[PDB]
């Protein structure tokens, strides 16, 4: 169950359903994005699809990247995978990565500090709010 701007989105069964009516699901966190059914004829959808095609040339690579990023919607246990993306610079890396976090909102997505991944763990017990950002986020 995923909270959206115009109700709550249920992805338990395909196709996904939007709950615009009264319900008793205990849901508090949400994103400001208003969910709409996928439509390839929407001008913004066309623009985004063309941008995705431009950023990632290979078809198989594009499909795998879109499949991996789509798992961000689900907030439960998932495959032990991480994606490492290398680029010379000014090649659209941060555009797509930040757009995913923008559309998920702060309650479900967050930028993480690089020192959280390439530095030694703090000695014994010390408070670590950077690691605490990982709670409840997809």
């Amino acid at each position: 169950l995923l909270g959206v701007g115009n109700g709550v989105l249920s992805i338990e069964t395909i196709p996904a359903k939007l709950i615009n009516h009264f319900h008793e699901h205990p849901i508090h966190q949400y994103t400001h994005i208003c969910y709409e059914p996928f439509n390839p004829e929407n001008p913004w959808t066309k623009l985004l699809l063309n941008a995705l095609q431009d950023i990632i040339p290979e078809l198989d690579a594009r499909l795998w990247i879109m499949f991996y990023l789509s798992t961000a919607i689900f907030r439960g246990l998932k495959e032990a995978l991480m994606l490492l993306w290398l680029g010379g610079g000014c090649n659209g890396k941060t555009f797509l990565m930040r757009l995913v976090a923008m559309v998920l909102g702060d309650h479900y997505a967050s930028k993480l500090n690089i020192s959280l991944l390439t530095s030694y763990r703090e000695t014994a017990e010390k408070p670590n709010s950077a690691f605490m950002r990982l709670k409840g986020r997809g």
Binding site: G89, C90, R98
Partner: protein, 138 residues
């Protein structure tokens, strides 16, 4: 707006912080007795020094962000008439003409006029400004 001064001899420029402070994207930090939070990075950066920074990287992601300019004129006492790039200094400029409200608001008006000029000439894109000197020096 944010500016840096007080640079030591031959300091090494941390390019990891460079990619993080000049970037149209979110950044993550923490204040005393406060939790983690993220905010958009929106500051114009200027650095002043008497020594060249040491840059130890050559990736396009770094050098696409940097611009370098060298000062030609010098302000002192008894300027050499044979040096066009040497001038008589006026202490008031820093002792008085930086604290007077009138010159401050005149400079603010100049900045607003130049912003309007940039908007109406290049659609707000600073990259489109033609300047051989900055490009050559960089």
């Amino acid at each position: 707006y944010g500016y840096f001064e007080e640079t030591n001899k031959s300091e090494i420029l941390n390019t990891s912080r460079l990619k993080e402070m000049v970037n149209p994207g979110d950044v993550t930090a923490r204040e005393l007795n406060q939790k983690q939070e993220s905010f958009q990075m929106t500051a114009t950066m200027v650095a002043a020094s008497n020594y060249n920074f040491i840059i130890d990287t050559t990736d396009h992601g770094t050098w696409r962000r940097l611009r370098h300019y060298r000062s030609k004129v010098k302000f002192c006492h008894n300027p050499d008439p044979n040096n066009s790039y040497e001038k008589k200094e006026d202490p008031r400029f820093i002792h008085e003409y930086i604290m007077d409200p009138n010159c401050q608001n005149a400079f603010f008006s100049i900045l607003v006029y130049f912003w309007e000029k940039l908007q109406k000439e290049y659609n707000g894109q600073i990259k489109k400004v033609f300047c051989p000197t900055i490009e050559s020096e960089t």
